[PDB]
């Protein structure tokens, strides 16, 4: 991550570009949420999954 | 540190416009430090302010010649100019660029340092005049007191000045150069003389060069006996 | 950071009586202000393009107040004792530090040109206001025109002021207003302002050079000597982890926004120990 | 010229003169600082004093400035003949656009300065000038003191008032003065009479020069 | 004057305008010969109308002058109208266009 200042001010003639600015935020949230939720799950199962067949394998 | 220069003396007709440039010598134009002048002097008269420039271009000018008066910087060349518009012989002036370092303009707290020779800007409806260049040389009836004297005669010019150096720069010693004559004609009239011993009269080479920057008129003269 | 204590960016930089933070700050890497600043624009009126000003002077790498036009020497044939009781310090009608109300001297208000060359190498950010009285009587009183204007040029900025009088719902007791108004005047560059009435004159300008890209934060949090790389509005943030939950809105290096309560990653193996 | 200066002082060697600088509330009563320059006879201007009082390199402590209100003053104490030049002082005016200015000037005169007889030195018309259909005869006059001179020309032993050109004396670096007096003629009338001559008068003591066409 | 334009191309008209805004009322007397100047420029679309502020600028390219520039997107079968007594930069040329897809501009010393 490059240095960034995620907040931006708007004025009460400028709902509109608030808004653009709240889906771009709320857009970004959903996907990293989602995808590091489900990686996470995914990824555990996967390394758990690794430790079982090396000891099978050492076995 | 910093040394300053002025563009050469000269003619500017009536109604028309004077332009003038000061090289800087000895450091950078480029120095935030600096407003880079340029002050007047009417021959007799007083000093007056004309501007003063930053090298971006930004200036500041006298109030009453703020709408006649354009200034500017030229990085490159390590110059500055003036130009000046619809010019009365009131404009007939000596021309100084000088120098002053500012921090804050309206402190009020400025002089002017680094000051150039000047520049005589003679305003006239009147035609650019060469010099008719004479020697001015001594008897060959005369019996030596202890010293002598020989010249050149810088003859009906427009307008001022000339400049009169003897052997190329090498004569400096015993030099005179006058001032001219405003003849009753318009032209002008100047000479200058030089006194050496007796001795080195027959036994040493005179020559007088003359320069009329205005006319670009260079003329060397031999001064013999 | 710039703490603002109960200023806003506009109490602040307009030098709002209230507002000092003594011998002043020359760079800082974002602003701190309260969710709801009490000191601002003591006098009413219009602060132009203010979320523009405040985003843009987030972050500053080099800062210094000098006084573009000084008060005590400029207007010689201008009154600039004006001052409101809007604006109070301590119990006495004072007004901002970084303007001047100019009115007339001896029964007329001359005309004014003044002119200032950018000679700081430096973004000069240069601040003015207009006057708008309330009646063509107050008009007439402290300018002597009713055909008032406000010239502001520079190479890329040109605008011309009118003065419009109005009946106004009064705030901080006043009918009148100054509209408030900013130009970045860029390296080498001069703003003229040229007027017959109603200028509240700059006093003191700024040379800046705006720093990469930063912003406000709104928190009454205390201030401490320690580093980050992350800051949130509740406190700062350890960077390293990829994730956080603490606050959508930061500024840094930050780890990213998530809805998430847990996120952890299995090294090991099950432990089975029984 | 908004800042008023004396068009003139005077004193004697090692006494003090006192330039007086006179300003208005726009400059020197709005706090502007007040600068000076010496112009000596066809040279520059030079700084003097800068920052009201301060003395730059090659400027000795017989200099001095000081500011008071909305004046200035230059002092010279234990004057010396070198100081006689003129003397301008500048400031500020913030009335208008924000300009510098100067005052008027003051002609410094030093008393005392020995009464200097003048020197000169007579021309015939050249060789190469006469051959051009012309003639001149240059009387070249310098080193006196005080600066008031009258030229008289003589063809043969007779006055000439046709053809002569004087100059208005004007001052050297050494605080002398110097003028020079052209006589116009043709070939014609420089070979037709004996000998011409040139009479200087400075002080009622006259100085006399002659030259003919062998 | 007054000087409209019916848009017979079927496409959008790209029509230019400036407005001249002298340094002293010298000049806006000796070329318009008016102190109190406008310019209109009306369509179905557009409606402006501009006054001269003549100022003391910073000289720009030699200019204590300006000219501000204007421009509007002629919709088909659309009248613009021009009415000035001073200070109108007149158009001359105007573009009858069809506005592509979405695009933008590259700022390259690569050839071509
Ligand atoms: C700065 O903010 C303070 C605090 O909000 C303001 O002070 C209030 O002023 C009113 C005046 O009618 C008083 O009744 C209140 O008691 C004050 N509040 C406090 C908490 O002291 C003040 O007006 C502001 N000053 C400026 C110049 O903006
Ligand atoms: C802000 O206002 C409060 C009272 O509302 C006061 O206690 C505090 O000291 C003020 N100053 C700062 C810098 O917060
Ligand atoms: C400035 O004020 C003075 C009076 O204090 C007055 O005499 C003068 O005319 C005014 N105008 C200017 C431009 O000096
Ligand atoms: C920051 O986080 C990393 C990884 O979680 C950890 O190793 C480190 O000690 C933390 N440092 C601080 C100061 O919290």
């Known amino acids: 991550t490059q240095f960034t200042a995620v907040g931006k001010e708007f004025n009460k003639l400028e709902r509109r570009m608030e808004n653009l600015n709240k889906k771009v935020d709320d857009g970004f949230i959903d996907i990293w949420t989602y995808n590091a939720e489900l990686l996470v799950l995914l990824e555990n199962e996967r390394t758990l999954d690794f430790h079982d067949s090396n000891v099978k394998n050492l076995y | 540190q910093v040394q300053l220069q002025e563009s050469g003396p000269g003619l500017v007709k009536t109604s028309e416009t004077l332009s003038l440039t000061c090289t800087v010598s000895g450091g950078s134009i480029k120095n935030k430090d600096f407003f880079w002048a340029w002050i007047r002097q009417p021959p007799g008269k007083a000093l007056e302010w004309i501007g003063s420039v930053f090298y971006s271009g930004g200036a500041y000018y006298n109030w009453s010649l703020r709408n006649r008066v354009t200034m500017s910087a030229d990085t490159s060349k390590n110059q500055f100019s003036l130009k000046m518009t619809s010019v009365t012989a009131s404009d007939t002036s000596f021309y100084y660029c000088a120098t002053s370092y500012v921090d804050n303009w309206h402190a009020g707290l400025h002089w002017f340092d680094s000051w150039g020779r000047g520049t005589l800007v003679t305003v006239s409806g009147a035609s650019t005049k060469g010099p008719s260049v004479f020697p001015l040389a001594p008897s060959s009836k005369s019996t030596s007191g202890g010293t002598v004297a020989l010249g050149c005669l810088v003859k009906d010019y427009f307008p001022e000045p000339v400049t009169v150096s003897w052997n190329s720069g090498a004569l400096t010693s015993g030099v005179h150069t006058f001032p001219a004559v405003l003849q009753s004609s318009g032209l002008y009239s100047l000479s200058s003389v030089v006194t050496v011993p007796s001795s080195s009269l027959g036994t040493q080479t005179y020559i007088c060069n003359v320069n009329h920057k205005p006319s670009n008129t260079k003329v060397d003269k031999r001064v013999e006996p | 950071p710039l703490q603002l204590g109960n200023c806003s960016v506009a109490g602040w930089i307009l030098g709002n009586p209230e507002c000092e933070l003594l011998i002043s700050r020359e760079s800082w890497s974002y602003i701190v202000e309260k969710p709801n600043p009490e000191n601002g624009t003591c006098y009413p009126g219009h602060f132009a393009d203010y979320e523009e000003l405040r985003e843009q002077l987030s972050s500053v790498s080099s800062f210094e107040r000098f006084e573009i036009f000084p008060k005590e020497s400029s207007w010689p044939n201008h009154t600039t004792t004006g001052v409101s009781a809007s604006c109070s310090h301590n119990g006495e009608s004072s007004f901002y530090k970084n303007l001047l109300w100019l009115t007339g001297k001896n029964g007329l208000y001359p005309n004014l040109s003044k002119s200032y060359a950018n000679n700081k190498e430096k973004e000069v950010l240069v601040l003015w206001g207009v006057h708008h009285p309330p009646n063509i009587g107050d008009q007439r009183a402290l300018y002597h025109t009713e055909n008032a204007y406000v010239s502001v040029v520079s190479s890329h900025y040109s605008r011309k002021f009118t003065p419009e009088i109005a009946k106004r719902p009064k705030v901080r007791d006043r009918e009148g207003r100054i509209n408030y108004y900013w130009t970045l005047l860029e390296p080498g560059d001069t703003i003229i302002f040229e007027a017959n009435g109603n200028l509240i004159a700059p006093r003191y300008a700024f040379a800046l050079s705006r720093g ?52 952890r990653m299995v090294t090991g193996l099950r432990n089975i120990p029984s | 010229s908004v800042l008023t200066q004396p068009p003139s002082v005077s004193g004697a060697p090692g006494q003090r003169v006192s330039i007086s600088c006179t300003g208005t509330h726009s400059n020197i009563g709005a706090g502007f600082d007040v600068h000076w320059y010496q112009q000596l006879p066809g040279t ?3 700084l003097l004093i800068y920052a009201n009082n301060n003395r730059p390199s090659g400027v000795p402590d017989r200099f001095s400035g000081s500011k008071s209100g909305s004046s200035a003053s230059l002092a010279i104490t234990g004057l010396q003949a070198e100081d006689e030049a003129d003397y301008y002082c500048q400031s500020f005016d913030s009335i208008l656009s924000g300009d510098l200015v100067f005052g008027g000037g003051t002609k410094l005169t030093v008393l005392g300065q020995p009464k200097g007889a003048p020197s000169v030195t007579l021309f015939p018309p050249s060789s190469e000038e006469l051959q051009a259909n012309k003639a001149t005869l240059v009387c070249l006059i310098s080193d006196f003191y005080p600066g008031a001179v009258t030229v008289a020309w003589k063809a043969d032993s007779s006055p000439v008032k046709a053809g002569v050109e004087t100059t208005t004396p004007s001052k050297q670096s050494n605080n002398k003065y110097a003028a020079s007096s052209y006589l116009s003629l043709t070939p014609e009338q420089w070979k037709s009479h004996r000998s011409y001559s040139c009479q200087v008068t400075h002080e009622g003591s006259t100085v006399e020069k002659t030259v003919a066409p062998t």
């Open chain 3, 212 to 263: 990469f890209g930063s912003g406000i934060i709104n928190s009454n949090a205390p201030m401490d000597e320690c580093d980050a790389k992350c800051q949130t509005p509740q406190g700062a943030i350890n960077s390293s982890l990829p994730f956080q939950n603490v606050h959508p809105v930061t500024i840094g290096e930050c780890p990213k926004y998530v809805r998430s309560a847990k996120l």
């Open chain 4, 44 to 46: 520059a201007p030079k």
